[PDB]
């Protein structure tokens, strides 16, 4: 019963569990985690990111 409950709970919750620190967002310094990177992170070295006003 303990093993079955362990397996079932883990299989129930592992779908939800995700790594926050999986490098996914590309960056000039290689793929990085989402929290480190924002829209201002240069995708490639020397990229121009204008401070565009949102009309």
């Amino acid at each position: 019963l303990g093993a079955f409950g362990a397996g079932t709970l883990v299989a129930f919750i592992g779908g939800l569990i995700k790594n926050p620190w999986k490098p996914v967002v590309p960056t000039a310094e290689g793929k990085k985690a989402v929290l480190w990177t924002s829209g201002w992170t240069p995708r490639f070295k020397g990229e121009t990111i204008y401070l565009a006003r949102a009309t």
Binding site: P26, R43, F44, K45, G46, E47, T48
Partner: protein, 54 residues
């Protein structure tokens, strides 16, 4: 507690230099090209201007 990194009284700074962006190596596989033409020479393309002065 205060955050480890704060405050800088010295080193007033400098005016940022004029930004000179670089062509995208990642987004563009190669170099973006403008006018298209046969250009049976070293290469001139489909864009050629000139200003005739006095």
């Amino acid at each position: 507690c205060s955050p480890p990194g704060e405050t800088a009284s010295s080193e007033p700074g400098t005016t940022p230099a004029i930004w000179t962006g670089s062509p995208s190596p990642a987004a563009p596989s190669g170099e973006d090209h403008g006018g298209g033409h046969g250009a049976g020479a070293a290469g001139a393309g489909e864009t050629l201007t000139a200003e005739l002065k006095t």
